[PDB]
Paper text:
The most widespread of these mechanisms employs a “controller” (C) protein encoded by a gene downstream of its own promoter, and usually co-transcribed with the endonuclease (R) gene as a single transcriptional unit. The C-protein binds at various sites within the C/R promoter to regulate transcription of its own gene and the associated endonuclease gene. Unusually, in the RM system Esp1396I, the C-protein also represses the MTase (M) gene by binding to the promoter at the transcriptional start site, denoted OM where the C/R genes and the M gene are transcribed convergently from different promoters. Flexibility in this loop is very important for DNA sequence recognition, as it has been observed in the nucleoprotein structures to adopt different conformations depending on which operator site the protein is bound to.
We also crystallized one of the mutant proteins bound to DNA and have determined the structure of this DNA-protein complex, to compare the conformation of the DNA in the native and mutant complexes. The DNA duplex was designed with overhanging A-T bases that, in the crystal, formed a pseudo-continuous DNA double helix. The overall Y37F-19OM structure was essentially identical to the native complex, with an RMSD of 0.5 Å for the main chain protein atoms. The three major DNA base-binding residues R35, T36 and R46 were in essentially the same positions as those observed in the WT-19OM co-crystal structure, making the same interactions. The structure of the DNA duplex in the Y37F-19OM co-crystal structure also closely resembles that in the native complex, with an overall RMSD of 0.6 Å. The tyrosine residue Y37 in C.Esp1396I is implicated in DNA bending due to its interaction with the phosphate group at the highly compressed minor groove in all the known C-protein-DNA structures. However, we find that the overall bend angles of the DNA in the Y37F-19OM and WT-19OM complexes are effectively identical at 54.7° and 56.0°, respectively. This would suggest that the missing hydroxyl from the tyrosine, and concomitant loss of a key hydrogen bond interaction, does not affect the DNA distortion induced by C.Esp1396I.
Residue numbers in the entry:
A (entry chain A), B (entry chain B): 2 to 77
The structure:
DNA sequence: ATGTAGACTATAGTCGACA
DNA sequence: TTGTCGACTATAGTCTACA
């Protein structure tokens, strides 16, 4: 599947971990269902941008740091 | 009305007019549908990442660049 | 904590027509 | 050239439940 989608997932995980949160934690804060989040980390589902906008806000990270991390990441 | 969303659409249209592509022109290059590229650009309808990613390709815009451009457009 | 399965519902995308 | 309307098909995002 998608080159990007995967990298995205890979960044979310890292952030989520750094912050030391469990999946259900974030699910709550993001107001998403836990399962979805698993799908995202493990298998890189597609998510929508409304979905991302929640999760950014769930990790309590700036929609700017994410993207930044994301770039250095994308850089291989 | 997702902040992140309108800020995604704007960049799309910006890139598209710079590249002087038409929406149809985009529709082709993104293997996606005119009416949708319409919806995104015009009324904050909610694309996904695969959709996004395709779009970057339709614009012939490197992901890095898109996000870079994007970032800057938040910070206004 | 996390992964996954399946039934389900909501909304992402397709298409063809016409201001 | 692009937005909108309406009826489509496709899937994202939920939920229960068990290893």
């Amino acid at each position: 599947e998608s080159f990007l989608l995967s990298k995205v997932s890979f960044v979310i995980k890292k952030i989520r971990l750094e912050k030391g949160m469990t999946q259900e934690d974030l699910a709550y804060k993001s107001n998403l269902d836990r399962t979805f989040i698993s799908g995202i980390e493990r298998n890189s589902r597609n998510l929508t941008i409304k979905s991302l906008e929640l999760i950014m806000k769930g990790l309590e990270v700036s929609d700017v740091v994410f993207f930044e991390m994301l770039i250095k990441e994308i850089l291989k």
